[PDB]
Enzyme design. Structure first.
Site, PDB file in Angstrom:
ATOM      1  N   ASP A  32      -3.654 -12.795  -8.998  1.00 30.00           N
ATOM      2  CA  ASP A  32      -3.692 -12.904  -7.473  1.00 30.00           C
ATOM      3  C   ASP A  32      -4.708 -11.979  -7.088  1.00 30.00           C
ATOM      4  OD1 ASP A  32      -3.289 -14.031  -5.085  1.00 30.00           O
ATOM      5  OD2 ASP A  32      -1.225 -13.780  -5.104  1.00 30.00           O
TER       6      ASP A  32
HETATM    7  C1  LIG Z   1      -7.267 -12.892   6.593  1.00 29.07           C
HETATM    8  C2  LIG Z   1      -6.393 -11.789   5.526  1.00 29.07           C
HETATM    9  O1  LIG Z   1      -5.126 -12.175   6.190  1.00 29.07           O
HETATM   10  P1  LIG Z   1      -4.332 -10.535   6.881  1.00 29.07           P
HETATM   11  O2  LIG Z   1      -4.485 -10.819   8.398  1.00 29.07           O
HETATM   12  C3  LIG Z   1      -2.465 -10.402   6.555  1.00 29.07           C
HETATM   13  O3  LIG Z   1      -2.753 -10.100   5.099  1.00 29.07           O
HETATM   14  C4  LIG Z   1      -2.574 -11.239   4.062  1.00 29.07           C
HETATM   15  C5  LIG Z   1      -3.366 -10.829   2.630  1.00 29.07           C
HETATM   16  C6  LIG Z   1      -2.879 -11.662   1.208  1.00 29.07           C
HETATM   17  C7  LIG Z   1      -2.160 -13.122   1.837  1.00 29.07           C
HETATM   18  C8  LIG Z   1      -2.000 -14.274   0.689  1.00 29.07           C
HETATM   19  C9  LIG Z   1      -0.785 -13.791  -0.013  1.00 29.07           C
HETATM   20  N1  LIG Z   1      -0.455 -12.471  -0.126  1.00 29.07           N
HETATM   21  C10 LIG Z   1       0.731 -11.794  -0.569  1.00 29.07           C
HETATM   22  O4  LIG Z   1       1.784 -12.217  -0.042  1.00 29.07           O
HETATM   23  O5  LIG Z   1       0.812 -10.801  -1.381  1.00 29.07           O
HETATM   24  C11 LIG Z   1       1.590  -9.571  -0.820  1.00 29.07           C
HETATM   25  C12 LIG Z   1       2.012  -8.789  -1.953  1.00 29.07           C
HETATM   26  O6  LIG Z   1       0.811  -7.404  -2.090  1.00 29.07           O
HETATM   27  C13 LIG Z   1       0.506  -7.314  -0.958  1.00 29.07           C
HETATM   28  O7  LIG Z   1      -0.859  -6.634  -0.702  1.00 29.07           O
HETATM   29  C14 LIG Z   1      -1.498  -7.646   0.325  1.00 29.07           C
HETATM   30  C15 LIG Z   1      -0.508  -8.935   0.157  1.00 29.07           C
HETATM   31  C16 LIG Z   1       0.648  -8.529  -0.210  1.00 29.07           C
HETATM   32  C17 LIG Z   1      -1.028 -14.308  -1.512  1.00 29.07           C
HETATM   33  O8  LIG Z   1      -1.948 -13.703  -2.107  1.00 29.07           O
HETATM   34  C18 LIG Z   1      -1.049 -15.882  -1.850  1.00 29.07           C
HETATM   35  N2  LIG Z   1       0.313 -16.470  -1.355  1.00 29.07           N
HETATM   36  C19 LIG Z   1       1.303 -17.095  -2.416  1.00 29.07           C
HETATM   37  C20 LIG Z   1       1.952 -15.923  -3.640  1.00 29.07           C
HETATM   38  C21 LIG Z   1       3.216 -16.464  -4.042  1.00 29.07           C
HETATM   39  C22 LIG Z   1       3.146 -18.177  -4.191  1.00 29.07           C
HETATM   40  C23 LIG Z   1       2.546 -14.500  -2.792  1.00 29.07           C
HETATM   41  C24 LIG Z   1       2.730 -14.617  -1.425  1.00 29.07           C
HETATM   42  S1  LIG Z   1       0.373 -17.446  -0.059  1.00 29.07           S
HETATM   43  O9  LIG Z   1       1.645 -17.220   0.641  1.00 29.07           O
HETATM   44  O10 LIG Z   1      -0.483 -16.761   1.109  1.00 29.07           O
HETATM   45  C25 LIG Z   1      -0.011 -19.319  -0.329  1.00 29.07           C
HETATM   46  C26 LIG Z   1       0.870 -19.849  -1.293  1.00 29.07           C
HETATM   47  C27 LIG Z   1       0.647 -21.353  -1.689  1.00 29.07           C
HETATM   48  C28 LIG Z   1      -0.479 -21.979  -1.026  1.00 29.07           C
HETATM   49  N3  LIG Z   1      -0.611 -23.490  -1.321  1.00 29.07           N
HETATM   50  C29 LIG Z   1      -1.209 -21.474  -0.079  1.00 29.07           C
HETATM   51  C30 LIG Z   1      -1.167 -19.933   0.446  1.00 29.07           C
HETATM   52  C31 LIG Z   1      -1.873 -13.466   3.163  1.00 29.07           C
HETATM   53  C32 LIG Z   1      -1.887 -12.511   4.329  1.00 29.07           C
HETATM   54  O11 LIG Z   1      -4.959  -9.425   6.622  1.00 29.07           O
HETATM   55  C33 LIG Z   1      -5.623  -8.663   7.639  1.00 29.07           C
HETATM   56  C34 LIG Z   1      -4.839  -7.044   7.959  1.00 29.07           C
END
Ligand SMILES: CCOP(=O)(COc1ccc(C[C@H](NC(=O)O[C@H]2CO[C@H]3OCC[C@H]32)[C@H](O)CN(CC(CC)CC)S(=O)(=O)c2ccc(N)cc2)cc1)OCC
Lengths: 116, 116
Positions: A32
């Site tokens: 990821d």
């Molecule tokens: C524009 C940037 O956004 P921001 O405003 C807010 O931060 C963010 C940073 C990363 C993410 C993305 C997300 N991160 C995350 O949850 O990992 C966390 C653990 O580790 C820490 O370290 C930083 C992250 C955390 C995952 O990679 C992906 N997902 C799935 C996965 C499980 C299936 C794990 C959730 S999914 O839910 O999104 C998704 C699932 C299925 C789909 N068909 C489409 C989307 C969202 C918000 O940043 C600015 C401050």
């Protein structure tokens, strides 16, 4: 290796995870690039080990008690890696039992994302 | 190009997104191999355009109405690609205004994850 990207097939890898609170276990973890920190299932720890509280960014906004932080480093071994990945701290999934290899681990694998 | 992975810097890119409901817009999107589907901020749309409802699995349990689905394909252009990515539909973040390039888009870039 080269891991192709397909919306239909999660990019997963088998990794031996050593929580240092029980015997190492090989699990299937999602590679990821969007994860700042690695996520490990709480099933890989003992139920007598301390974890620390902390907020985490998640697909639902903000989740208070879903994710905990490890207290001891976590060592991660890949099938193609003799040496272990050592993460000073990583998240622990107390519910969903998620296994996520984040950028913290991918940095130590010299892993990269390539767009032709 | 080759995008290094570091927990301290997110793999983001500037992408021109054409929702087909207003003029194309350049935004900064997070390159996310763990995202099955692309997510784009609703700030890119008109307040008169129809979106469809949809579930998505996410951190913190289950969110019913947080994410919406587009009704028309979404075109995405990256700096190193003259030709646009055309996503049959992708998710629309009605709150956080997230920009996430998922594996649906990375597949059309013939994007891969490589760990040496
Ligand atoms: C524009 C940037 O956004 P921001 O405003 C807010 O931060 C963010 C940073 C990363 C993410 C993305 C997300 N991160 C995350 O949850 O990992 C966390 C653990 O580790 C820490 O370290 C930083 C992250 C955390 C995952 O990679 C992906 N997902 C799935 C996965 C499980 C299936 C794990 C959730 S999914 O839910 O999104 C998704 C699932 C299925 C789909 N068909 C489409 C989307 C969202 C918000 O940043 C600015 C401050």
């Amino acid at each position: 290796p080269v891991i192709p990207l397909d919306p239909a097939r999660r990019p997963v890898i088998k990794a031996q995870v050593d929580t240092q609170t029980s015997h190492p276990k090989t699990i299937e973890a999602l590679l990821d690039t969007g994860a700042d920190m690695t996520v490990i299932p709480i099933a890989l720890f003992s139920s007598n080990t301390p974890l620390k509280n902390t907020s985490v960014l998640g697909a639902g906004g903000q989740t208070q008690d879903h994710f905990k932080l490890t207290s001891l480093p976590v060592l991660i071994r890949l099938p193609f890696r003799t040496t272990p990945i050592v993460l000073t701290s990583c998240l622990v999934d107390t519910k969903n039992n998620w296994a996520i290899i984040g950028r913290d681990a991918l940095q130590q694998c010299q892993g990269v994302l390539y767009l032709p």
